[PDB]
Amino acid sequence: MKGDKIVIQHLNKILGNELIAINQYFLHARMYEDWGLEKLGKHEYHESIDEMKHADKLIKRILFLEGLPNLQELGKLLIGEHTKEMLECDLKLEQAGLPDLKAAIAYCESVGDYASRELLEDILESEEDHIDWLETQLDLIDKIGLENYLQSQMD
Amino acid sequence: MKGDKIVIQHLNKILGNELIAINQYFLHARMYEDWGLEKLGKHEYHESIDEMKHADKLIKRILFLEGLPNLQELGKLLIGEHTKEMLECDLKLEQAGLPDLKAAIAYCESVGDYASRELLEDILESEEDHIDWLETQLDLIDKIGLENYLQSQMD
Amino acid sequence: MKGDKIVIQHLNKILGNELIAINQYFLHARMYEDWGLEKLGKHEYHESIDEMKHADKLIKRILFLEGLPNLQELGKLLIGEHTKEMLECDLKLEQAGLPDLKAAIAYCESVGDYASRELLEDILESEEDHIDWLETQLDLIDKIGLENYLQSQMD
Amino acid sequence: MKGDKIVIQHLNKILGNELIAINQYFLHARMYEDWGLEKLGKHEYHESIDEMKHADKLIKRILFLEGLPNLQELGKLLIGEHTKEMLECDLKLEQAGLPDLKAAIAYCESVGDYASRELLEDILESEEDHIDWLETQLDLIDKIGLENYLQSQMD
Amino acid sequence: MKGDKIVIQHLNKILGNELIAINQYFLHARMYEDWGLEKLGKHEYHESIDEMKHADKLIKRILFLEGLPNLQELGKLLIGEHTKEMLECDLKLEQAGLPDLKAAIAYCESVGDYASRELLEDILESEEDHIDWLETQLDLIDKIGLENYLQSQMD
Amino acid sequence: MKGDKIVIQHLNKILGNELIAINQYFLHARMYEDWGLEKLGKHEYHESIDEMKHADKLIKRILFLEGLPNLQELGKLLIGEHTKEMLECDLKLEQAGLPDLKAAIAYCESVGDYASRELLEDILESEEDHIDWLETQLDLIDKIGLENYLQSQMD
Amino acid sequence: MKGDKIVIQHLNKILGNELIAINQYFLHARMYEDWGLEKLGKHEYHESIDEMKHADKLIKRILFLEGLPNLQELGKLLIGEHTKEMLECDLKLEQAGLPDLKAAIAYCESVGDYASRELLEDILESEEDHIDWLETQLDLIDKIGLENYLQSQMD
Ligand code: HEM
Ligand code: HEM
């Protein structure tokens, strides 16, 4: 089925954001498990896999709309060097991708592409859940301290 | 454990090649399923997952050697538009990726990094298996014809 | 027990024929799997294993008759290069092996070695089944075409 | 995939050695069971099956490298007449194949055919285990005597 | 069904041989058990039971052909007094019973009594198996010694 | 099978290092469990068991090569007094045996003792994993503090 | 809990004896399995493991008494060249072990370290059982001969 060109452009932009998130989250997850923080590494790995599933869904939607997925464009990775830094980098990545999803949802509503809007709404809910988790982790770091928090992530 | 810098550079080169393969294979797999070729799409998806696991193993090895994985650089993907074309593109990608693995194995032998050598040997064996599969598919296309071959890829 | 010398000579001749068949069928089976023809490869592998069991049975019979099995002699191998050629080579070998079995059965009747005749009768019944299968495959090739036939051997 | 011609030659030579071992070990196994020595016959049969699997692996590797396996050439078998001679013949045959395997592994190292090196290394370890077993049996014959040794091989 | 009179005579002769075998083998088995050689006694008992089944089959075949089974004639038993002697006696009986079976099979072929020929062929195969076992046991005695051999027959 | 004398010398040196590691790790595990740090005690116990298996494998290889294992010589023991000190002592011991394994692997490659090279390669991989765990533990001590770290080792 | 210094000295001496026994028994077990003597190898392996558990118990007891286990010093190792000689060496080691255990038990009685006496009593009973087994094996060698004895150790 032929889709709207601007809808395909929005889907490609979201796909590029998801591609950035996949690499950033996987590298963060692997650097967490390297330091012995199995809990944080496992959670970041699960979030990365969720990002891969989001990218797969976007690729399927673009292909159904007779568009061309853009896997080539990989943007800047926001990689941190310590646990707090990587948590803030992940939160900033999540926040920076939120306006794009909202704009895509609004445009899909405006031109009557309701299935794409439903898919983007599911993606937006997932991104909001990740944002909530990251903010909760940072607040916990503030409440209990860095050492206690890092101890809680040991196992 | 501190590793050799040149070994880190070789591992980063292989990791970049693996990322290229991941993106190209996932795109080809999802374009196969869109055409109704479930079998070819499933095999391409499995190949992409294997490339993902190779990239994960390389990232783990680089992080163990106190290096910095380079996931930021994504090179040119060889994306095809018809089944024969994308099979040939995958074959070209695999053939181009072989010399880097062999050079990395030779260097690991030279400097005595034997665990990295075993890792790269496993990766090389997997790449050779994929090459064998791709060549078998192309020869089967030449033997039984494109129309017969594409029919067997349904379901 | 001590058997007839000429019976042992006939058994040795059939054993050499079976060894030739083992080698040819195993090579054909392996080059079938390499091309991607799983069905033909599996059937040729099973036929090869049947030839191996026949050779083992002949070795046991020769040993019981206080003779020396002759595994040193390996004659000409009729190795084909394309599927039809392989099938015709196997059929030609199987047809050339038949007169020796019939002559040996007749001789075992002449001198009253009835257990050896029963063994050779079982072997001959198996060889006739292999001939029937090969002829059926060639007739199917001539009936449905080479490309259609090769597609059915993919899986 | 096209491999090195000299690597294919080494693989073919090792395949011929494996075929010789297959024939010799099967004949020895069968003449062991004829004497009532079930244990020695069973172990020789298992060794012959292992040699068959080695030959199969070599055939597959040669086929992958786009070469022609040489099943035609079968060299001299080292057949014994009593148990001690059979064991010494098997040990001599196994020790005469180690230099070929070692040279092939060294050459595969030289030209960077690492998958072939891994295959040859696996079969070399198997041959070394067979040599260990043969030497242990020959030393046990001298430790406990021929009559005591043959009695333990009955059941 | 009315059979051929000479076929009935041959069957009666074979039955008379089978009865002698039954008695001799049962007696040998019982003295083997009495001496404490449970393994040899068990094998001899099984051999006697097999001869018993052969006699039963012969009686059934004679009765089907409207003939009169002759169980009255019991000829001389070859009873031994030590293990080697009774193994040799069994071998002598089994070898002396062979020409009658072969002559009966030849006559059944000549007159066209094919079912009787199949029965006698099965009997002949069994007798050959017993001959093989007896010769193997005697060769084992000559190879490992009487004292070692008898120790293996305790259980 | 007779092996190279220098290869046996290298294996003997590695075996002595393994025995040193066995004794030191067992003592460290016992004092860890004595202080009430069950997790550290359990991991040190498992590491000591792994060292025991390494020593067993080396002894088997030396005996197969017709050499004489040197269990008599046991070198100095790097015994620590506190958790940080014993972790550092274990890391130093593991780093001080790595060059020996690397030199042994290089020599086994040079003279063609490939099975010994594979055994030493497996041992080297195990020692590298132990080094990774020890460095991770020390970095975790630095990250979360000694008091927090020791609390997590209680259960 | 603080214990007597002399009790700790006795425990350390017993621990050194146990370490000597561990090394000697493991080496003897390995060469027993190398020669093909599975029964003797398995029993020596189990005896060695029992010695390891004895040493572990002694280490725990020394650590509980707030002492310092002496794992460093490894004394003479009575290694034999043939089965009879190694059995005599093991018996000599076990017999030389006894007086130290008896003196330690008597001293623990004298100063009222009753738990240590119970531990040493269990160890003494185990050593007495090993002595009984070793003397039984030597008496069996005398009764049935070396060649007959070694045959029973094959499997
Ligand atoms: C640096 C890049 C990537 C790495 C290191 C990576 C790694 C992985 C790993 C280790 C798995 C686990 C496989 C398993 O457990 O069987 C996985 C699963 C998966 N990945 Fe990736 N991946 C990457 C990029 C991508 C991309 C770009 C996509 C899609 C556009 C993708 C799609 C998937 C899917 C669909 C799965 C399976 C999900 C499931 O089984 O439920 N991945 N990946
Ligand atoms: C004198 C020559 C040979 C004899 C008498 C012989 C005999 C046998 C027998 C009796 C079996 C057992 C099959 C079963 O139990 O199902 C067997 C298995 C096998 N043979 Fe041989 N064989 C010979 C040569 C070869 C050769 C030349 C090859 C390959 C080049 C080969 C490859 C195999 C394989 C792959 C198996 C199956 C192993 C398995 O299923 O685990 N054999 N052979």
Ligand code: HEM
């Ligand atoms: C010096 C050379 C040594 C060698 C070659 C050796 C070898 C072994 C082996 C092969 C095992 C079997 C592990 C398993 O089956 O999972 C084992 C277990 C064990 N070893 Fe070591 N060991 C040595 C020294 C020691 C020492 C010095 C001690 C104590 C002071 C010790 C204590 C133990 C214990 C407690 C076990 C567990 C046994 C069980 O769980 O049943 N070992 N050893």
